[PDB]
Write a protein that binds this ligand. Structure first.
Ligand SMILES: NCCOCCNC(=O)[C@@H]1CCNC(=O)/C=C/C(=O)N2CCC[C@](Cc3ccccc3)(C2)C(=O)N[C@@H](Cc2ccco2)C(=O)NCc2ccccc2CC(=O)N1
Length: 164
């Protein structure tokens, strides 16, 4: 069955609640496994303690740069980067979980959660899951963003892992 993972998120130390994500291992197993392992921290690194560094209302909330905290860094469990697995799943609406990148075949650890349908990213970013619980928490994160993406509070993934 598809893995379920969680992000517990805070803003300036105040808990916002839990986001639960279903990872579509049935369609993108390699991309799902990378995210799952970065949630559990089992390789010795991952999302715990890192930030949503770029949050743009009516677009998406971006996170996963646990090395540089600014959209330039991150690393996968497969080495630094890994290729785009497929573009089967589309950016259909709020709650889509997809890989951030810097062009083709540059996936590492950065990811985003959409707050709208972002169809112009179809075929360019690998979609690999969806929010199943806690979209209200995603909307709280979104509320601390701005047009440039700079956040007005430090938004931290306080804890994360797999629900089994
Ligand atoms: N109309 C309503 C809504 O409208 C909104 C319209 N805006 C949209 O569509 C916008 C329009 C186009 N601007 C952008 O590409 C924004 C770029 C941006 O912020 N950099 C800041 C961080 C560094 C940069 C450049 C750099 C430097 C060093 C190393 C690698 C790269 C640039 C980057 O590129 N780092 C990746 C992250 C990443 C690196 C490695 C793995 O991951 C990044 O952030 N990629 C951008 C991105 C991330 C997640 C989802 C989508 C998108 C596309 C997007 O943001 N597209």
């Amino acid at each position: 069955a598809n893995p379920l993972v969680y992000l517990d998120v805070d803003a300036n130390g105040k808990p916002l609640g839990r986001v639960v994500l279903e990872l579509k291992a049935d369609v993108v197993p390699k991309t799902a496994e990378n995210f799952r392992a970065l949630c559990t921290g089992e390789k010795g690194f991952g999302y715990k303690g890192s930030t949503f560094h770029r949050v743009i209302p009516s677009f998406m909330c971006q996170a996963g740069d646990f090395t540089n905290h600014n959209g330039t860094g991150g690393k996968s469990i497969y080495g630094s980067r890994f290729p785009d697995e497929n573009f089967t799943l589309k950016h259909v609406g709020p709650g889509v979980l997809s890989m951030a990148n810097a062009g083709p075949n540059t996936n590492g650890s950065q990811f985003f959660i959409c707050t709208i349908k972002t169809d112009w990213l179809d075929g360019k970013h690998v979609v690999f899951g969806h929010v199943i619980e806690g979209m209200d928490v995603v909307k709280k994160i979104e509320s601390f963003g701005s047009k440039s993406g700079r956040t007005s509070k430090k938004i931290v993934i306080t804890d994360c892992g797999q629900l089994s």
